[PDB]
Amino acid sequence: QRMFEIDYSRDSFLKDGQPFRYTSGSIHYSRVPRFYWKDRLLKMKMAGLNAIQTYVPWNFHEPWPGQYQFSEDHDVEYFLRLAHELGLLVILRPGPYICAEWEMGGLPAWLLEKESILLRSSDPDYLAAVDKWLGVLLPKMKPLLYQNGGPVITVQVENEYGSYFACDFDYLRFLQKRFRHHLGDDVVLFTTDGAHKTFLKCGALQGLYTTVDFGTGSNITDAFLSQRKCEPKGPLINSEFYTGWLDHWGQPHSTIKTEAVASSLYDILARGASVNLYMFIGGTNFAYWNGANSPYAAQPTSYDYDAPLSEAGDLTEKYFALRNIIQKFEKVPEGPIPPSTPKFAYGKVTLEKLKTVGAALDILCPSGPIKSLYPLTFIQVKQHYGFVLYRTTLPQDCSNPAPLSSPLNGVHDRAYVAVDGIPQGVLERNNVITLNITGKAGATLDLLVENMGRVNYGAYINDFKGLVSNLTLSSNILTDWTIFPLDTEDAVRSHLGGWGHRNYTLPAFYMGNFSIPSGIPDLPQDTFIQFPGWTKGQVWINGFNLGRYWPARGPQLTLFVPQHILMTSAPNTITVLELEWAPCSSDDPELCAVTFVDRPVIGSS
Amino acid sequence: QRMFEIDYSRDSFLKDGQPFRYTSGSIHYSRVPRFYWKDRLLKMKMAGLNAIQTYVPWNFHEPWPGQYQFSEDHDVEYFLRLAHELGLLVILRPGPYICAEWEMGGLPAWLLEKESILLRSSDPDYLAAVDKWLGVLLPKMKPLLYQNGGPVITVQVENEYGSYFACDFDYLRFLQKRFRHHLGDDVVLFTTDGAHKTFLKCGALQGLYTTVDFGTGSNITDAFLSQRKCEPKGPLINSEFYTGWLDHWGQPHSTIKTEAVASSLYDILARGASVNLYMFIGGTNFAYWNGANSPYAAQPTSYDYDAPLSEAGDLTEKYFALRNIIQKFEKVPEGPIPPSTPKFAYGKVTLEKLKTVGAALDILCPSGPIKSLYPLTFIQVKQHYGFVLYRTTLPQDCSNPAPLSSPLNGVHDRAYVAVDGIPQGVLERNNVITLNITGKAGATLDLLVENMGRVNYGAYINDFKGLVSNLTLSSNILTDWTIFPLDTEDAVRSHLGGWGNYTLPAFYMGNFSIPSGIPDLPQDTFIQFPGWTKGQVWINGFNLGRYWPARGPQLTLFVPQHILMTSAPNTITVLELEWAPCSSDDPELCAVTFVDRPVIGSS
Ligand SMILES: *[C@@H]1O[C@H](CO)[C@@H](O)[C@H](O)[C@H]1NC(C)=O
Ligand SMILES: *[C@@H]1O[C@H](CO)[C@@H](O)[C@H](O)[C@H]1NC(C)=O
Ligand SMILES: *[C@@H]1O[C@H](CO)[C@@H](O)[C@H](O)[C@H]1NC(C)=O
């Protein structure tokens, strides 16, 4: 019978009766394709880590109530078995809120169908949904608990609840009760909060062990004293020792020096503390999974994070320096390290425009639109991610430019506006709430509205999306709306129906093919796609949504392309949805193209 | 129907009635694992070549009489269909003698069962063997001719016969006839010789189109004049334009500057000549396949050649330079070129002694030895490659150092000498024909003799191997021999039966694992032997060739990834012949290393 426990007398963990502490690394299985899970986990082991830490994003597994995804890239059970087979332990963080620069901090958007829900509280509607999620997830985690033969040694309840305004201790008690019900009475349950009494006040709970987080700019002594104030006995734990930091579109790429991380890691380890490296590998926010901060600023597609392992899993100087730190305390595994993957510049691939969004509406919205007097939000129209088209008619002639506006700043988050197929420009949450339009009376006014990511931290995580308040034209509220939820993902997988079902330009889908020879042992290889001359959009290869590009803002210019979605002999189909301006009018088809390169550019001006 | 022909009227090839010239690179399918055949061939095509040229080594396919190998790495037909699939035409060179820095110039050693055989002549026993070989090979090549829907556009008869002393024209005429009977009247048949009347004299033949070869050192106008003397009309052809040159153990690694190859290549092509780059990729002489020159000098395991593609298929600066010459004459295919393969340094892998050769004779020689009054050759003992142990007893006492000698220099090619299991040192063909030994009377005298590779060029290609003449001790002829042919390949595959200043020749073995479920492992690597001296190496039973870090220039041996596994451990076996770094109290010195770069040009 296997045991894992906190030893209070000796300020230590006990593993099968023996003293234990962990040196862990954060890896998010939802940000690494499964094809590479073993690769990253093995490099994590060879670095000298004896555990890994991950988050379970609720919204990654229950995109509608009672419809679950636990297979393929969503197979959290297999991921945890893979960690166990490699001799790694696991610190599980199942939320139900994870923060994590992930859409809505992991909470499902369909929770907002109750408009007034208070998230992360004893709101009975929030609790009932949490409870049903825990009834599905936790029984799957139970045989993976250390004491039942699996790798899970500790489990985090909530995530820095001390940072949220609500301070609902009933909430935290309900989670504890439920985690206990499903997992048993022996599993070590813990919390993590900023290393300061003001955060620990509302984050800490009797019965759950109190850990802190802090990075290389914090005084180590103060931070651990802050923890000691809440737990006078038991191990010192930094649950998120920051190896890097998050980005936002339009801001420079965050970095943290190798020497600062190495030195702080040395100091933490020397105190005998358990430590988790956040992030050890960051990876990618594929599709629409990124989050945002308030005041509204979205995080980009890359989650490279400047982590010791790069986005594509490369071994960096930082990796080796940290491995060397760990070597001073433990005997790191022997033998060569699995390498940085080979990267391949497939070169330039021409695209051509297939159809505008407005022309593809039949395929994007095959059940037809929802008619409404005033606009409806993403949530009301039963779409959570991507894009929704809002359509009306001009109730006046606008031969002279008239102001189209959202007086309460409720374009959440960007609208690409057209009037009888003539693009008018953009409305933008917080930046531009008015845009002048022209056209005749009775012209069709289209706003293509993009969810850029639900805020994942702060008070404003109840971030519905779409047109969340009225639009006016010349000060008068525009009524009579036709609203098309866009099934972009299906439509792209069907090549807009073409394959069956077995200054600005109009938002449109541009497609192009490239081939890769068979019988070559080293092809395909990973690559990086770049969009010189494009502006802002979404990109897919063979229907796999790689995420968002926005070279107009940076810092990210390339997107990471893992080799397993690429195919040999059979043509690889690139689909680009360009929202703002495509380099594709002129009589040079060579300009209407993307380029694959062999080094990332995530760190641009 | 398709047509390929020489139009003499027009000084050109005509393919389907249209003017044609080829720009070809040599690739020997026998020197590249089949796992990488498509890689090398598609790199060749992206370089701008419209054809490849290969040699068919007889002995690679007919190791004993009427026992054939045409499968897997030996599948020539497949290799040609592959070239064809990729849109490449083929210049086939089926010998029967191919030269090629390859064991006896491709000729099987079993021809030497007739001691007096005159190789490459109308010796009727040579011709009868050749003829049975042609009757198995050429009916296979027939459907692969251009005219029957395959890739083969021209076929070479013999190889540089003008360089051989025999000058037997009836041999050449027999070859033409038998090539015609099996291939038909339309195939373009041709010969290749050095570009000088003295080489063409005995190489050229009526009804076989005369081509020449030459490298970057030659006057290109004079070279083609020497050909035009022989063929006043038809295409100019340099069948072997040297991109590089061969190596010998113990000599500096050969190189030819990129600018010289590019320069000549442009000049040849500009004349409207057809040309074949020898080698475009060289590859590897795995196992015992390397040849030798006279006076006896063996070529190494690596056949990199300083070719445009390195031993391991890598794209080199030479490669891009020649691609760029070709581009000025022909649009070259679009798209990215397949990359140089990633290389992985597996690092250090410790070995430990398994068995001496002396102590492994039951598994190496399970038939029992051969008693003979005087020494027999490798051929008489029915073994072709590798090693044979010769054993006798000392007749006199050698308390004091007695001379052991092969006075006619008859150790072919190297002997690892032991008396009662005490290594005495080494006898070398052409270099050390005497070694002073000691031991008691009745002591066991052992000589482990190595076939270092049969000479592939010159008069002395009838290279029997073994103790080819007598050995004397204190000038007395040593008699009464117990001779053990050694099944090294089976023994190694079976871990020497254990299934489920000098040292004694001995096998050393160790293991290393590679993780499964890593998309980019295993990778190609280079194995290196710091501290070792001379020997043979197998990984998972596959004989990667010979090592000789004592002599150079080659220090690393190429290991291709497809023979490496992840489902169970990989085994390295070394047969060290001279000195093993495994006596020290430090097991960590008894070890090889895998690195991620080649060292084939050490001084
Ligand atoms: C950190 O804080 C302690 C007191 O808790 C202080 O005494 C120490 O000097 C500080 N260290 C640094 C590096 O500022
Ligand atoms: C819209 O047009 C009016 C002129 O009618 C101008 O005063 C105002 O600056 C414009 N607003 C925007 C957002 O361009
Ligand atoms: C739109 O306009 C009217 C105010 O006249 C209000 O009743 C309604 O709630 C507003 N709708 C939205 C979505 O803001």
Ligand SMILES: *[C@@H]1O[C@H](CO)[C@@H](O)[C@H](O)[C@H]1NC(C)=O
């Ligand atoms: C791209 O590929 C698919 C088949 O894989 C096909 O349906 C589409 O029409 C192609 N276009 C081109 C130019 O190959």
Ligand SMILES: *[C@@H]1O[C@H](CO)[C@@H](O)[C@H](O)[C@H]1NC(C)=O
């Ligand atoms: C080659 O020889 C010819 C005479 O045959 C002479 O005209 C020419 O200069 C030589 N070319 C070179 C490059 O030496």
Ligand SMILES: *[C@@H]1O[C@H](CO)[C@@H](O)[C@H](O)[C@H]1NC(C)=O
């Ligand atoms: C014995 O061997 C030595 C060592 O090389 C050799 O030089 C010498 O000629 C031999 N001595 C006699 C007396 O024959």
Ligand SMILES: *[C@@H]1O[C@H](CO)[C@@H](O)[C@H](O)[C@H]1NC(C)=O
């Ligand atoms: C060795 O010696 C004797 C001559 O004294 C002779 O019968 C025989 O030809 C020789 N054998 C070889 C292999 O040299």
Ligand SMILES: *[C@@H]1O[C@H](CO)[C@@H](O)[C@H](O)[C@H]1NC(C)=O
């Ligand atoms: C496999 O190789 C390892 C080297 O780590 C060695 O210790 C072990 O004895 C080998 N096992 C077998 C079955 O040869």
Ligand SMILES: OC[C@H]1O[C@@H](O)[C@H](O)[C@@H](O)[C@H]1O
């Ligand atoms: O990368 C920044 C991190 O900040 C922490 O406060 C949070 O707990 C993490 O989930 C993540 O948001």
Ligand SMILES: OC[C@H]1O[C@@H](O)[C@H](O)[C@@H](O)[C@H]1O
């Ligand atoms: O690399 C030197 C070459 O010499 C050629 O003349 C011969 O035909 C080839 O087989 C090869 O040996």
Ligand SMILES: [Cl-]
């Ligand atoms: Cl985590």
Ligand SMILES: [Cl-]
């Ligand atoms: Cl050839």
